[PDB]
Design a binder for these strands. Structure first.
Ligand SMILES: Nc1ncnc2c1ncn2[C@H]1C[C@H](O)[C@@H](COP(=O)(O)NP(=O)(O)OP(=O)(O)O)O1
Ligand SMILES: [Mg+2]
Ligand SMILES: [Mg+2]
Length: 430
DNA sequence: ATTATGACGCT
DNA sequence: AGCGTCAT
């Protein structure tokens, strides 16, 4: 009892931007603000593919992966913004630069781990300790947490007919219970972490004009889950004590890393649907079905416990460019293949050169991946070679050299390629 | 014809 | 080294 770890050692948050690519386009074009809007790529086929959707547009049922022509059927007044196109492919530079704006603000507060173009984990354990020392015995006011939800509250016994009324009542219950006394209560630490995350979210909105949501908990999985509970423009605190009720009706697929085959297996092999049901199995039983690492992870995670560290990494480990060639457009000639490789290499060269100037590093390996027609896998084949010069002509020529014997017969290229992907990796200081 | 592209585990 | 999974 006295010796059972409860996964309450850290304070971790996950900050994720709300409808991020849309906000980027709305900041730039004020006519799009506060309107049902989506961002699309490649307008020629079915009006383009939607990759981001404003919350006003979601209310009509518009979603990612939907065709714009189809989205317009659900939402006639839907406004659209097109992703920039360069060299015949989508160019996501505008969103990467916007991402940098936000990541640089978050880094001021604590160590972060970039997790995607629009989210990062934050390890607030040290910052909370410092803040706790800064205010001795200072009780925490509700005004310090104007956009925070406490998951699981309010509980027990009219302002609650509306959502802000629920939020405030739950926050009051939580704050009324908190003992400022006792610098080591995990709940107190989370609360101070939440205050700091309000400050962080305020700074991002002030300095970039972008709104975001956040989750604060004791580990990355719970912080990520918490982030999505009250999006948009709100933050949610998930305490250790909230986990049994929260996990009791939480579908297994909603937990990070369980959204694929492993999660399906868990459900299928154990005959359960919710994360909390995992507690009735022994660690050995879970290890026997899903392996040593997965079994141990599951046994601790269904109890709200996870030890994956927030890595101190702001910069991407790899830099890559890819393009799909669906259906009839699959590449069928040598020349075609070489031209598209050159287009990808030119974009890559730009991004690498910038990376070298900004971050004092150079990539040393080039990985080329291709997908052949009829193959469902992301990558049909991967090959690599040395990246010794940031030269687009050398890179595209070397990439062709490494995959040219994949061609069964021809001038002609077969089987046709439905994807080309160039990735620069193995960075070293410069 | 659900795209562009990341991190990282397994062998 | 090369492939498979899970992810936004
Ligand atoms: N499958 C995909 N393919 C291409 N781009 C994608 C993508 N999923 C996301 N993006 C791009 C476009 C997105 O804007 C961005 C962030 O991904 P989220 O955080 O998953 N989604 P958002 O921020 O939009 O809304 P909110 O978080 O409020 O739910 O990455
Ligand atoms: Mg987001
Ligand atoms: Mg995200």
């Amino acid at each position: 009892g006295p010796h059972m770890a409860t996964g309450q050692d850290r304070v971790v948050a996950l900050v994720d931007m709300d409808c991020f690519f849309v906000q980027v386009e709305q900041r730039q074009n004020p006519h799009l603000r506060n309107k049902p809007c989506a961002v699309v790529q490649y307008k020629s086929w079915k009006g383009g593919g939607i990759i981001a959707v404003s919350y006003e547009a979601r209310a009509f049922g518009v979603t990612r992966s939907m065709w714009a022509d189809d989205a317009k059927k659900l939402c006639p007044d839907l406004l659209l913004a097109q992703v920039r196109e360069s060299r015949g492919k989508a160019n996501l530079t505008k969103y990467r630069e916007a991402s940098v704006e936000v990541m640089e603000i978050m880094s001021r507060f604590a160590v972060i781990e970039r997790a995607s173009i629009d989210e990062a984990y934050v390890d607030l354990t040290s910052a909370v300790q410092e803040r706790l020392q800064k205010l001795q015995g200072q009780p925490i006011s509700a005004d310090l947490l104007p956009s925070t939800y406490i998951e699981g509250l309010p509980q027990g016994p009219e302002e609650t007919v509306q959502k802000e009324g629920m939020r405030k009542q739950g926050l009051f219950q939580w704050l009324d219970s908190l003992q400022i006394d006792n610098l080591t209560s995990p709940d107190l630490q989370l609360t101070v972490g939440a205050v700091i995350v309000e400050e962080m979210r305020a700074a991002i909105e002030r300095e970039t004009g972008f709104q975001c949501s956040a989750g604060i908990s004791h580990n990355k999985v719970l912080a990520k889950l918490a982030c999505g509970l009250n999006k948009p423009n709100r933050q949610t605190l998930v305490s250790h004590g909230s986990v049994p009720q929260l996990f009791s009706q939480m579908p297994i697929r909603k937990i990070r890393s369980l959204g694929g085959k492993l999660g399906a297996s868990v459900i299928e092999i154990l005959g359960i649907e919710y994360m909390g049901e995992l507690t009735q199995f022994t660690e050995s039983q879970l290890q026997s079905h899903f392996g040593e690492k997965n079994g141990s992870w599951l046994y601790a995670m269904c109890r709200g416990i996870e030890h994956d560290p927030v890595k101190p990494r702001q910069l991407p480990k790899t830099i890559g460019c890819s393009k799909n060639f669906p259906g009839k457009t699959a590449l069928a000639t040598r020349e075609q293949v070489q031209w598209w490789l050159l287009q990808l290499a030119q974009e890559l060269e730009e991004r690498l050169t910038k990376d070298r100037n900004d971050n004092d590093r150079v990539a040393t390996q080039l990985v080329v991946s291709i997908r052949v027609q009829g193959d469902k896998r992301l990558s049909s084949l991967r090959r690599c070679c040395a990246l010794t010069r940031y030269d687009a002509h050398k890179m595209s020529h070397d990439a062709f050299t490494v995959i040219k014997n994949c061609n069964t017969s021809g001038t002609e290229w077969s089987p046709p390629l439905t994807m080309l992907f160039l990735c620069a990796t193995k960075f070293s200081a410069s």
